[PDB]
């Protein structure tokens, strides 16, 4: 049966307005392994998103991580948008700096 | 310290694909060194670790030529295993498989394994005396009985006792580590009279980490907000855990980080 | 250095 993508949104480093960093977008325990992942920008997709490759757990759960480059600033919204065939809907995350 | 290698390989199906994709990856002690997808336009073994590069052309024509078999015995059993579950055309499909060896710290084989599953559930694996099989599926049963009048399992722990072990020897010569956490604890109020203290630990090597808040000298499991662990990227690894605190008392909440890379645990707390 | 499966499930 179908297990639901769990997703967490974060960056590489300690994020600092203004300061360039890394975003993942971090997609755990799903099955089937198909999946589509896109990572926005005040809602707008982010063009250039880098994909790892198809792996997966012990207990059998896929997983993959997708992130991108960004300055962080005080007022832009960063997301994570995931659709895979166990969700009627996407299932968007947002970027939270302290989380 | 204790070593391993594992293979993972996976064939997928889907309604809109006339053949399977089948990816094997390798790991040596967790981390991957090789890969085959048959995605590529060539496909073939791929080094996956730089130390792997000192292995020549025909190691890699070798391994390659073994997955391009491994790619068909995937197909077959694919089909194979749509009757067994009278499932019928038009659906995805996954068979998975993970084999390898355990290696104690004198690298004398401790365990080998053979397991695989089907749709993501465990289909059948090969017992820890490497001898016998166990299927819990009604149709899994089938597959059972073949392997047994075969008896596949004989081929099998002749490469987990033997060459498994051999080329992970191999292996760990041509590449012979862990990062501490660094933690430290944010301040968020969570309301009026209640505060969040967020322990984080970054920058850690391998992945496996606790995390605990007390209270005088009192474990708080349940209250307590984590996230999985979860990689930055770089090949290191992050967490936090976080508790809601009554504000002033933030000094009598000390947090703990346990790593298998620390010369002891770390306790901290929030500092002004 | 991979297994080789023998005996199709």
């Given at each position: 049966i179908q297990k639901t993508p769990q997703i967490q949104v974060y960056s590489r480093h300690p994020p600092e307005n203004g300061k360039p960093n890394i975003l993942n977008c971090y997609v755990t325990?799903?099955?089937?392994?198909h999946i589509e992942i896109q990572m926005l920008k005040n809602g707008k997709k982010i063009p250039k998103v880098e994909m790892s490759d198809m792996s997966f757990s012990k207990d059998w759960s896929f997983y993959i991580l997708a992130h991108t480059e960004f300055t962080p600033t005080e007022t832009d919204t960063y997301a994570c948008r995931v659709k895979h065939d166990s969700m009627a809907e996407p299932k968007t995350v947002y970027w939270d700096r302290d989380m | 310290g204790p070593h391993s290698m594992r293979y993972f390989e996976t064939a997928v199906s889907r309604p809109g694909l006339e053949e399977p994709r089948y990816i094997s990856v390798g790991y040596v002690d967790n981390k991957e060194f090789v890969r085959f997808d048959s995605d590529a336009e060539n496909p073939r073994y791929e080094?996956?670790?730089?130390?792997?590069?000192?292995?020549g052309p025909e190691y890699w024509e070798r391994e390659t030529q073994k997955a391009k078999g491994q790619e068909q015995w995937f197909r077959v059993s694919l089909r194979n295993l749509l009757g067994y579950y009278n499932q019928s055309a038009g659906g995805s499909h996954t068979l998975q498989q993970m084999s390898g060896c355990d290696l104690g710290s004198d690298w004398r084989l401790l365990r080998g394994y053979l397991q695989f599953a089907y749709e993501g559930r465990d289909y059948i694996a090969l017992n820890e005396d490497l001898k016998t099989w166990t299927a819990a599926d009604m149709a899994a049963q089938i597959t059972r009985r073949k392997w047994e009048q075969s008896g596949a399992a004989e081929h099998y722990k002749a490469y987990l006792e033997g060459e498994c072990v051999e080329w992970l020897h191999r292996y760990l010569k041509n590449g012979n580590r862990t990062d501490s956490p660094k933690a430290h604890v944010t301040h968020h109020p969570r309301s009026k009279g209640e505060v969040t203290l967020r322990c984080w630990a970054l920058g850690?090597?391998?992945a496996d980490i606790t995390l605990t808040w007390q209270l005088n000298g009192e474990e708080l499991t349940q209250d307590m907000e984590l996230v999985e662990?979860?990689?930055?990227?770089?090949?290191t690894f992050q967490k936090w855990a976080s508790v809601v605190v009554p504000l002033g008392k933030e000094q009598n909440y000390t947090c703990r980080v346990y790593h298998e890379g620390l010369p002891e645990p770390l306790t901290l707390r929030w500092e002004p | 250095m991979c297994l080789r499966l023998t005996a199709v499930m």
């Open positions: 325990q799903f099955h089937p392994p | 080094p996956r670790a730089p130390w792997m590069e000192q292995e850690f090597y391998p662990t979860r990689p930055a990227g770089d090949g | -």
